[PDB]
Amino acid sequence: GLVVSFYTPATDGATFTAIAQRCNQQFGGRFTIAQVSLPRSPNEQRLQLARRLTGNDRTLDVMALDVVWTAEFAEAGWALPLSDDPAGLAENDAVADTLPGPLATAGWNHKLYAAPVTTNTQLLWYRPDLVNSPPTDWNAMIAEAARLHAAGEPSWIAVQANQGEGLVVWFNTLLVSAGGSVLSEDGRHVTLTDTPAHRAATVSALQILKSVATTPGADPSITRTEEGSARLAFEQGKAALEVNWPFVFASMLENAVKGGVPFLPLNRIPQLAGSINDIGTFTPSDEQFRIAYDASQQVFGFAPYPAVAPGQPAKVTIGGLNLAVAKTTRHRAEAFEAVRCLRDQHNQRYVSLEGGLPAVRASLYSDPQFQAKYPMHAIIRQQLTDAAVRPATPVYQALSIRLAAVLSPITEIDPESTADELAAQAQKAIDG
Ligand SMILES: OC[C@H]1O[C@H](O[C@H]2O[C@H](CO)[C@@H](O)[C@H](O)[C@H]2O)[C@H](O)[C@@H](O)[C@@H]1O
C-alpha cells in the first residue's frame, strides 16, 4: 500500500498519530498516513528536516513546521507552494475558515506555502487572591509586582527571558504592540531605527524589558540570568503574575489535582478521585472539570496579554505549527489530500479538546464544547485575529540568534544604545 509520511514533533506524537489514524479511516484503502516523530527539541526538528530535504529523501511527504520557518523553507524550494496541488484544492482549503493570524504565518512572497494546523498565543495568568484586578498594561504589571514585594508577597513576574527564541518572542510582542517592526514586509530592510516612529517603538520595548528586569523583587532567573521556568515559578507560588502560552492552564489543573500546587489543593476534593488516569494524566468527566475549574478560579485566573499603550490592545506574537508538502514527495496529490484531512473540522476539534493544542479554524471558537474546555476562548480568538508576527525572512535563524545575543541578559539593556546594536546585528543577518 501507498504510505504518506507525516513528520511532526514527538512532543505531541500521540495526538498527531491519532488524527492520522482517523484520516486513514476515510481514504478507502487508497493510501495510509504514517506519522513520524521528530525530536522534541524544535532546533533538532528543523535540522533533521533540512538533512532529509537536502539529502533528497524521497519518502518525505508532509511536515509540520514552526510558524517562523515558512520563509526559509519556501525560499529554499523545500516547501512546495500550495498552488502545486494537482487537485487545485490546497489554497482554498488553507484560507477557508482559518483565522487571520495563523494564515499570515504560512505565506511568503505573496504565496501560501503551508496550511495552518495549530496555533498559539500568550495570555496573562494571575493570582486573583493576591491581585484584585489583572494588570491591563506593562506599567501596571510593574507597579503590582512592586506593591506585592513591599507587602512580603510573591513578587516575581514569571516570563521567559533566557537567551533564546522565547526572549525574541517577548521582544517582538512588545515591539509590534508599540507600533514597530524588526524588518520591512519583504524582509529586505531593517526597520528597528530607520524612522523616528520606528525608533520610538524599539526604545519603548527595550524600556519595558529593562524595567521588568529591575523591578523590586524580580525573578533571579532574570536579574542573575539563572535557570528557571516561568510555568513552575507560578505553580510553586513564587510569582503572582505570569505571561505564557495556554498550555499552563491544563498544567495548573493537572498538577493541582496531583498535589503539586501548594496554594491550590485540588487533591483534597473527593469528587475528583479517579480523575488521574493510568499514565498520570488528568482526564476528568465534564462534571469533574467544572468542579476543578470553579475551585481553581479562587486563586488562578486569566486575562488578555498586557498592553504597551493604555488604550491599545496588545499585538501578541503568534506561535504554532503549519503543514507543508516537501519537494521530495513522489505523491503530491495524496500529500495535499492528507493535509486537508489532517486539518478538517473534526480533527481540529480533536487536537484542541483531546490534545490541548489551540485550533486555527474560526468555527471551532463558536463551538460550545470547545468553549467549555477553553474558558479563555474569547481572548485567544481575539489575539489570533489581531496577532503580531515574527519577521518572515529566510535567514530567520541567524536573525533570531543575533537578536537574542544582544537582548540577553536583559538586565544589561541600555534602551537607546541597545536599539542601535539591535539594528546593526539585524543588518548583519540580512546581509549574510
Ligand atoms: O506552548 C507549547 C509549545 O511551546 C513552544 O512553541 C512555542 O514557543 C516557541 C518559542 O520557544 C515558538 O517558536 C513557537 O512558535 C511557539 O508555538 C514549543 O516549541 C512547542 O513544541 C510547544 O508545543
Curated annotation (Swiss-Prot):
One of its GO terms (cellular component) is ATP-binding cassette (ABC) transporter complex. Alpha,alpha-trehalose binds at residues 66, 120, 245, 247, 320, 390. GO terms for molecular function: trehalose transmembrane transporter activity. It is a lipid-anchor. It is found in: Cell inner membrane. InterPro entries: SBP (IPR006059). Disulfide bonds join 23-341. One of its GO terms (biological process) is trehalose transport. Its main location: membrane. Keywords: Cell inner membrane, Cell membrane, Disulfide bond, Lipoprotein, Membrane, Palmitate, Signal, Sugar transport, Transport. Being a receptor for trehalose, which is essential for the survival and virulence of M.tuberculosis, this protein is a potential target for antitubercular drug design. Disruption phenotype: Mutants show no growth on trehalose as the sole carbon and energy source, but grow normally on glucose. They secrete substantial amounts of trehalose during growth on glycerol. Part of the ABC transporter complex LpqY-SugA-SugB-SugC, which is highly specific for uptake of trehalose. Involved in the recycling of extracellular trehalose released from trehalose-containing molecules synthesized by M.tuberculosis. Trehalose uptake is essential for virulence. No binding affinity for maltose. Belongs to the bacterial solute-binding protein 1 family. Monomer. The complex is composed of two ATP-binding proteins (SugC), two transmembrane proteins (SugA and SugB) and a solute-binding protein (LpqY). This is Trehalose-binding lipoprotein LpqY. It comes from Mycobacterium tuberculosis (strain ATCC 25618 / H37Rv).
